[PDB]
Design a protein around this ligand. Structure first.
Ligand SMILES: [Mg+2]
Length: 359
């Protein structure tokens, strides 16, 4: 993590960069987690034009430790290589002792305000619709577990949360939501057997938020596939719809803002689902049926219910890992996702959508 060592590695692992020396290379650490240290590494532009280096930037990733990973760290690299092969993720460039080097994407992540732009929403639906056709249009590795990660994420993170003895003010009754977790997984096992396109099991990103969508040339691209895996495709869309209400760009405590009124509008949700199905169904994109759309939208809201529990548990675990480094209040965030669960459960009950859920 010493900058000159980073320069030395890049000069010998990026093609034609060895024509430079360490004084031609710039290293800028970008925001990292506990599992990663990320650096923007570049050749100074005037040095680049003189030597005519065409790959001026790379992304330099130093691996953390597996035990701190809340995703699955043992299969993350194999999954990323597959995504890189089919040009879905940023291109893997090289590996080194303790990390890897990836293509640098020029542009900016989408903002919370970009998700109000209807043209941006259409672009996102096209990208995700085409992306979700991967498992049926190409042959993904046959040994990959096809269990929907809604089960795996919920099970894995509920276990880690129940192993805590503190749990003071995240909720006074954590086992209420631990028992709610069991209710959702049992309901979703029945609910997803109903014939619904939204219940199709495809390879999913599973962390669809605006800052994981890059806007490069007006071509939207996905990044950060660490949580990716097989899942109900409605879960990927439900995550994106939820994220229209959460702003992570706020730069003071608690470093997030929730605006439930900003939830993607119904006409926007229609426009998204129609656009999505136009790309996800190929030989007959005849899914302009409103009853198919209205049922697509209902399955999305059902999956949204469980995502609030999934990410609340994730946030509880992150809160016990961190300790005033970014000062993002993971415990307040978890409490807000738990509140989102209660409000979503009430709404679904009020419309009789989660029958036999046993409140
Ligand atoms: Mg990210």
């Amino acid at each position: 993590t010493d900058p000159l060592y980073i320069k030395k590695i890049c000069l010998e692992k990026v093609h034609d960069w060895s024509r430079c020396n360490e004084d031609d290379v710039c290293v800028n650490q970008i925001l990292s987690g506990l599992t990663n240290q990320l650096f923007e590494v570049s050749i100074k532009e005037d040095t680049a034009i003189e030597y005519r280096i065409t790959r001026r930037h790379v992304l330099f990733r130093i691996y953390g430790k597996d035990v701190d990973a809340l995703y699955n760290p043992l299969s993350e690299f194999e999954v990323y290589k597959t995504m890189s092969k089919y040009r879905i993720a940023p291109l893997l460039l090289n590996t080194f002792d303790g990390g890897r080097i990836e293509e640098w994407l020029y542009g900016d992540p989408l903002s919370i305000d970009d998700l109000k732009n209807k043209s941006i929403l259409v672009g996102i639906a096209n990208v995700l619709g085409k992306f979700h056709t991967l498992s049926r249009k190409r042959h993904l590795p046959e040994h990959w577990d096809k269990t929907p990660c809604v089960f795996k994420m919920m099970d894995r993170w509920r276990l880690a949360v129940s192993n805590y003895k503190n749990l003071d003010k995240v909720t006074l009754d954590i086992n209420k939501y631990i028992q709610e977790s069991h209710k959702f997984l049992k309901f979703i096992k029945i609910y997803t057997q109903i014939e619904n396109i939204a219940n199709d099991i495809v390879f999913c990103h599973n962390d669809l938020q605006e800052n994981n969508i890059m806007n490069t040339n007006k071509c939207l691209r996905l990044i950060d596939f660490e949580y990716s895996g097989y899942n109900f495709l409605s879960a990927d869309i439900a995550n994106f719809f939820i994220e229209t209400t959460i702003d992570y760009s706020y730069n003071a405590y608690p470093f997030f803002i929730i605006n439930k009124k900003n939830y993607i509008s119904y006409e926007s949700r229609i426009l998204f689902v129609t656009t999505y199905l136009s790309k996800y169904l190929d030989d007959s994109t005849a899914a302009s049926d409103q009853d198919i759309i209205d049922q697509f939208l209902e399955a999305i809201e059902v999956q949204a219910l469980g995502l609030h529990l999934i990410w609340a548990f994730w946030s509880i675990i992150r809160g016990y890992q961190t300790k005033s480094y970014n000062e993002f209040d993971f415990f307040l965030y978890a409490k807000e996702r738990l509140k989102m669960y209660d409000e979503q459960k009430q709404y679904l009950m009020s419309k009789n959508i989660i029958k036999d859920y046993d409140d």
